[PDB]
Amino acid sequence: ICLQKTSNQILKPKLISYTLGQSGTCITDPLLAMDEGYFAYSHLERIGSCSRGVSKQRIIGVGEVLDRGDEVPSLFMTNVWTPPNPNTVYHCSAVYNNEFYYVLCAVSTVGDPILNSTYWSGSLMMTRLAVKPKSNGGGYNQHQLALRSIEKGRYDKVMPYGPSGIKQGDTLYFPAVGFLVRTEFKYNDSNCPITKCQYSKPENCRLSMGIRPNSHYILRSGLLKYNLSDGENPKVVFIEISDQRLSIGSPSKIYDSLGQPVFYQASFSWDTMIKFGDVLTVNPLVVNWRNNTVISRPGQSQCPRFNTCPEICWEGVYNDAFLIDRINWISAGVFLDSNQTAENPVFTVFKDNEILYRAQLASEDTNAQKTITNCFLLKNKIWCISLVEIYDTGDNVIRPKLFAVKIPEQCTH
Amino acid sequence: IVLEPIYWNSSNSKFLPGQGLVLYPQIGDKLDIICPKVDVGQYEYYKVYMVDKDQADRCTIKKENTPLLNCAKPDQDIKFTIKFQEFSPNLWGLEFQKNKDYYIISTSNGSLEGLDNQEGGVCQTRAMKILMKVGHH
Ligand SMILES: *[C@@H]1O[C@H](CO)[C@@H](O)[C@H](O)[C@H]1NC(C)=O
Numbered sequence: 001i002c003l004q005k006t007s008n009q010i011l012k013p014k015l016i017s018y019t020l021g022q023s024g025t026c027i028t029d030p031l032l033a034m035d036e037g038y039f040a041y042s043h044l045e046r047i048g049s050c051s052r053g054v055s056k057q058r059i060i061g062v063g064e065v066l067d068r069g070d071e072v073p074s075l076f077m078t079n080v081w082t083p084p085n086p087n088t089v090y091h092c093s094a095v096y097n098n099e100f101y102y103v104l105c106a107v108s109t110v111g112d113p114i115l116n117s118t119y120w121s122g123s124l125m126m127t128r129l130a131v132k133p134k135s136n137g138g139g140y141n142q143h144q145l146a147l148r149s150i151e152k153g154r155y156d157k158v159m160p161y162g163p164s165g166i167k168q169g170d171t172l173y174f175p176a177v178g179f180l181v182r183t184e185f186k187y188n189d190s191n192c193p194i195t196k197c198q199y200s201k202p203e204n205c206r207l208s209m210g211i212r213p214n215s216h217y218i219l220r221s222g223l224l225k226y227n228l229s230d231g232e233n234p235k236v237v238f239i240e241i242s243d244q245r246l247s248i249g250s251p252s253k254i255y256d257s258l259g260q261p262v263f264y265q266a267s268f269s270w271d272t273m274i275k276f277g278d279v280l281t282v283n284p285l286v287v288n289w290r291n292n293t294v295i296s297r298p299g300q301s302q303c304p305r306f307n308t309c310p311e312i313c314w315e316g317v318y319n320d321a322f323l324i325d326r327i328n329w330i331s332a333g334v335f336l337d338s339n340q341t342a343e344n345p346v347f348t349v350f351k352d353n354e355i356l357y358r359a360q361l362a363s364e365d366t367n368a369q370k371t372i373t374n375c376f377l378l379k380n381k382i383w384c385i386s387l388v389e390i391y392d393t394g395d396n397v398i399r400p401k402l403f404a405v406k407i408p409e410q411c412t413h
Numbered sequence: 414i415v416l417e418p419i420y421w422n423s424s425n426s427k428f429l430p431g432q433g434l435v436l437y438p439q440i441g442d443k444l445d446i447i448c449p450k451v452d453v454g455q456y457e458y459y460k461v462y463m464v465d466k467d468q469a470d471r472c473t474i475k476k477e478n479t480p481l482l483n484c485a486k487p488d489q490d491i492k493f494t495i496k497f498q499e500f501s502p503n504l505w506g507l508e509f510q511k512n513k514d515y516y517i518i519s520t521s522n523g524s525l526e527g528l529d530n531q532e533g534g535v536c537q538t539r540a541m542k543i544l545m546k547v548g549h550h
Pocket residue numbers: 171227228229230
């Protein structure tokens with residue numbers, strides 16, 4: 001791949017057909033996962049606004065990533081499941097293993113568990129979907145579980161929290177979050193990094209570990225482990241993230257790249273520079289976070305793009321990054337080139353201290369929000385597919401777009 | 414369109430004594446609300462919130478509310494930028510749609526000691542409130 005910084009237009013993003021409307025709807029809460037030539041996908045279709053429209057339909061689907069015909073990858077759905085009640089499924093997360101995708105979701109009758117954590121039951125469901133369904137294949141094609149046994153230690157409740165995870169042999173690990181009663185949280189305020197921040201107070205880090213400073217719970221990212229060798233009803237076991245560069249529990253992702261897992265955590269508080277790195281150990285979870293000084297995301301007033309000082313805030317966007325060269329530590333993702341607005345998605349290839357090259361996906365005033373990037377080989381070439389929540393002013397239907405971007409081998413225009 | 418920035422300070426004549434500051438932003442427009450750093454008079458401290466109509470009418474904020482501006486840094490302009498659209502970095506599900514009215518107030522009194530006051534303040538005494546009649550006119 002091109003390893004040089006360049007302003008040449010070497011990236012050539014292609015809009016690919018979506019996996020799968022009616023006017024005045026929003027396709028929201030997206031998930032895309034990819035592993036071994038397959039993908040998993042989810043969304044919520046709402047009638048009305050993206051945040052508060054009536055929930056019409058939840059989709060959970062899987063399929064294949066295939067050359068569409070001109071050596072450009074695209075997604076071909078093979079197997080779709082629709083939950084009976086679109087109102088009660090939240091925070092799905094997907095892991096592939098042995099010709100099935102496993103999709104772990106929260107079941108809630110009290111709304112989004114994040115926003116009504118004290119009342120949430122803690123109920124979880126696991127859906128298994130064959131990537132290649134069979135004629136009259138019944139339980140092979142689609143199979144449901146409620147997860148009865150959940151080991152969560154000190155945490156009051158635990159939940160999947162991010163689009164996708166990994167398998168190691170026949171053990172699945174989903175990105176997840178633990179809800180810990182705030183009065184039980186152990187934090188040394190002397191560790192809050194405020195030495196370069198004249199207005200920051202030692203308390204800021206601890207107070208910002210929950211969605212409000214006096215929240216009942218703090219949120220701690222981590223993994224939910226599910227060992228398929230246990231049998232037909234494995235337990236699920238929470239595994240907390242280490243406290244190095246701790247930030248509020250937020251949507252995260254663990255993925256395999258070039259022989260090792262990598263973890264990404266969204267920056268939903270004051271630490272607004274990209275949080276990702278190689279996984280040193282899965283259990284206990286330790287992440288060798290990059291000292292990346294160039295990738296950030298839009299926030300609001302208190303914790304806008306490029307903020308590094310501890311503040312009490314809960315805000316941001318999930319815009320993940322996918323390692324494409326480990327030896328040289330080069331990664332790709334779609335970032336929003338704005339300080340405080342959800343606008344202007346740009347596909348970006350970067351190192352810790354340098355953006356190498358980039359491509360604007362739309363216009364400067366195009367609206368965009370969550371982005372989920374996965375990279376892989378198609379006929380010997382490195383490709384990335386990015387799901388981008390996106391729309392332009394005046395559009396009567398809001399729904400994500402999929403962009404395929406081949407990583408250039410040469411740096412020449 | 415980028416709308417004229419709104420300076421959140423008690424000298425601003427655009428906060429009309431009866432009705433506050435009324436504007437008609439269109440979907441796709443952008444607006445900055447800025448608490449200016451101290452330079453003529455001393456720094457004015459404010460927490461500024463997006464609230465519902467009743468809260469605006471009554472000049473009250475609730476414990477559940479989170480500020481959109483925390484103006485407590487005398488040597489730093491503090492800016493909040495809004496785009497009138499469905500997406501944002503806001504995590505509470507707050508967004509903007511046509512033919513709806515939105516309210517921004519402060520019940521702070523301008524002094525450091527009154528920063529966290531929950532009733533009255535400049536919302537009441539100076540009509541430091543913004544009414545955004547989105548997609549109207
Ligand atoms: C999963 O279960 C099998 C069978 O008991 C066991 O050998 C293996 O160590 C487990 N894997 C884990 C815990 O990663």
